[PDB]
Amino acid sequence: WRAEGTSAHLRDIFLGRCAEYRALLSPEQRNKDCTAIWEAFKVALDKDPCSVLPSDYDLFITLSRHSIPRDKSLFWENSHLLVNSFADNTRRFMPLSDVLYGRVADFLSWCRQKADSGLDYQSCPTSEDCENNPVDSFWKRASIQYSKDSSGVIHVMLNGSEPTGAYPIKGFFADYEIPNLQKEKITRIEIWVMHEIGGPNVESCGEGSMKVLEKRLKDMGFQYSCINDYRPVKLLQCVDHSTHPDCALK
Amino acid sequence: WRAEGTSAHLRDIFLGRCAEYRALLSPEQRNKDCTAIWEAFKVALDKDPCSVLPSDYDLFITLSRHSIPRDKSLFWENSHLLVNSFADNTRRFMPLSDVLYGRVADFLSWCRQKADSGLDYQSCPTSEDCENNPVDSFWKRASIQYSKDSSGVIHVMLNGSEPTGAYPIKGFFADYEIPNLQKEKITRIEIWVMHEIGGPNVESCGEGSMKVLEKRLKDMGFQYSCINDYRPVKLLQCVDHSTHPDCALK
Ligand SMILES: *[C@@H]1O[C@H](CO)[C@@H](O[C@@H]2O[C@H](CO)[C@@H](O)[C@H](O)[C@H]2NC(C)=O)[C@H](O)[C@H]1NC(C)=O
Ligand SMILES: *[C@@H]1O[C@H](CO)[C@@H](O[C@@H]2O[C@H](CO)[C@@H](O)[C@H](O)[C@H]2NC(C)=O)[C@H](O)[C@H]1NC(C)=O
Ligand SMILES: NC(=O)c1cccnc1
Ligand SMILES: NC(=O)c1cccnc1
Fold it and tell me: Any S-S bridges, and between which cysteines (chains A, B)?
């Protein structure tokens, strides 16, 4: 295979993450059964590593699905860590990685042996290796869910120091989330184009790809707006470049 | 008992944290047994909620003890969340809550029911209820170990907006950490007295309790220094007060 092998102590981690996340859920929704969630998640783990479909994770999403505060969703591209860091375990925001079905699988990897019945710790199929692998189908399922369940003001943090462009016209946000946003429940969409401190300003609002994304969102009938280096997040990046001039306080 | 009962799903959480922490450990140190560790830790959950000594966690420490990067230790008082936050899971610094024996219990509570054998999810003997309770003893033990395995530059984060002064003469830093710092392997001690954004500036370097701390550290032969609102951390605080003037950029 060409992707990272299945995560060590996957079950241990999974159940643990799920365990801690409960305290975060509202009482009415605290009732989650992690072992049931794990048992359901495993259904895809038993199948051929190149024959897993998003729909396989339907049961898993059923037992772990839960509400997302209006105005607290945070979609993103090329900024996984920064997103996790800023959101702060649902405190500031609630990105997919901060929703039960996302938290449990964040940064992890998994797949069954190509021929054997165990877990392949050597390597898992990437997108190229074959489309229907467990990790991709999972995130396709989870992201679709996350999008349908979002509401209010939708925020999107993009990387403007990304060589190839801020908005990947072919990533999860573009292919699986935007097509699944519920217009009736969304008031407007806000984009945060974050540039690296000092880093290359490859693209800012309304430039290049950001023009495509903007045109598409508007064509769809959404209310659009874009911000460059949204201050709160700029400050966070600054935590690691305090001496740099872009991070100097008055 | 004047303290919160044992955390729900204590074992799952303990085991989950441990599992994920291994990934951060160095290769020739990554070989840890989370179940054995939990088993050792649990020895205290089989005792009288008021008859647990730091020694009882000895074996637990033996099975979890691991080296701490030089210059990476970060002691603190009155700023638990900010410390954890700024430390970023061993990325920026490595506080006791980011050491395996400290991570597995960070923010969790526990203690067995006085009479019965089961855990008490109702309450737990707080320091005043009786000194030798499960939680306190655990930390006394974890603290001493942490102080002992520290070397290089010692950073300490204190809270200058604290109503009682930045340095508590009776606290873990005071009663268990400072007393166990191996002087021979410490270059110097640096203090960060952080003030709330706009918040009350009760004390700053060289004032109030800070004079008491500074004297002891020096008298002890350490090389002392103090910084009001260390910039990196100030910027982190600023993340939640971007519009405030103390957080204004240029
Ligand atoms: C935003 O995009 C840039 C460019 O892709 C990312 O920078 C790269 O980060 C990796 C990991 O640290 C480095 O190996 C590369 O050398 C970086 N490239 C450059 C030109 O510096 C950056 O990490 C992204 N920011 C976020 C928050 O994801
Ligand atoms: C620094 O100390 C202050 C003083 O307690 C903390 O602020 C208080 O926080 C508590 C809750 O943790 C509130 O009930 C009080 O109203 C706050 N008082 C003030 C004056 O702000 C502050 O959170 C501490 N900072 C850190 C990082 O621990
Ligand atoms: N970890 C995440 O939040 C995530 C991963 C893959 C696709 N979309 C979101
Ligand atoms: N919980 C903690 O991280 C902690 C408790 C007591 C002393 N030092 C650190």
Answer: 18-34, 50-130, 111-124, 205-226, 238-247
